[PDB]
Amino acid sequence: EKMLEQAILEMQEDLVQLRQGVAQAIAAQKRSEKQYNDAQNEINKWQRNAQLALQKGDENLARQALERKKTYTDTSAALKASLDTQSTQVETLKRNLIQLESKISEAKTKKEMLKARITTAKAQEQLQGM
């Protein structure tokens, strides 16, 4: 039972560390989303400027805006790709935490079962002494 007691204390601290790690992953996804959102907003603003340029009649300004938009789109695409890869990793981490929660409860149940057999063995030893 002592080994189980030692393990129970050890598992609890580890879970907290995992939660912090999960938060960082969550934060990273949020950070990418914020950047992606900013890019989309910037692209919309850029599109309006391009539309304004067409009304103005300055072809060169519009062309420059289009190039900027393309660069922004590429950055957005890269961010989107990163998010998808990150999401799969994040899901696994979330799944692991859920699995761990089920496992700790099981461990507590296991301790009770383990304790009873050990006690029975000790009782048998007492009989031998008699």
Place this chain on the structure above:
Amino acid sequence: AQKRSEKQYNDAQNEINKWQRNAQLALQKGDENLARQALERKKTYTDTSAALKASLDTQSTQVETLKRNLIQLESKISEAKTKKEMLKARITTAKAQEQLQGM
């Protein structure tokens, strides 16, 4: 340990009943997502309860043996006392025989 598992099992059953009521309330509310989440929680709770039940059964067999051993021991100590009287008499007789040899 058996009592502790039972208490946990009882708590889980109570929690499950409460969860079921919430799910029923959710259906009345019309929020499908809340009900689905509750069902998942109930399933997890059920699994924990099942594990606890399995542990209790294993524990009970061990517990019964321990209880049986104590009962057996109680019979044995009484027998030992009876044995002491019988053992004492033969030893005394042997000592008496030795005295005769000395004479």
Place this chain on the structure above:
Amino acid sequence: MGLFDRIKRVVSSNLNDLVNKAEDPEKMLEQAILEMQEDLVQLRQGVAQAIA
């Protein structure tokens, strides 16, 4: 893996002695009620600043 084996044995012995002295119902109960009330006041001040 000597360190890991050593750590498990050392941790179990140390933890058991510490918890028994630590686990007193009367002492634990008195400390907890005072702490939560203090925490609420601090939280309120932060909230007040945001409100301000």
Place this chain on the structure above:
Amino acid sequence: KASLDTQSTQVETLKRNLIQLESKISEAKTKKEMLKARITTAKAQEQLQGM
């Protein structure tokens, strides 16, 4: 209320236990007088028997 009911049952059990204890101590007092009388007779008899 739930807490009170559980606590009340425990309290009732404790009261019942006390009554049982009271019966036991009273019996013990009676036993000492009986035991002393038995011991005195045996001691007197042993000395007499040897002679």
Place this chain on the structure above:
Amino acid sequence: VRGMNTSSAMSAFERMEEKVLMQESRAQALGELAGADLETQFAQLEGGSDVDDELAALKAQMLP
């Protein structure tokens, strides 16, 4: 709200629960053993047996 390990409320509940659970379990087990013993079992019957005869006697006693 989440309940951190260092939080006072979470720690207090766990400590209180462990002490309470151990005391309650130990008392019940000891009590059960006392109940299990044969001496306790027929003592209750004796008390039950004793009162009914006394009640009949009491009625006779109170009759005149």
Place this chain on the structure above:
Amino acid sequence: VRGMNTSSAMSAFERMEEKVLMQESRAQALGELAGADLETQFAQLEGGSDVD
């Protein structure tokens, strides 16, 4: 109620019983031997014979 080894009531009963049992047994055995002897046996008869 259970009767612990350290309990005063349980210890007192056991100690009292051992002393009482030994004293009672020893006296009875010695008394029986005196009764067993022939001198005691016809002495009673002599007394009975003498009174009539």
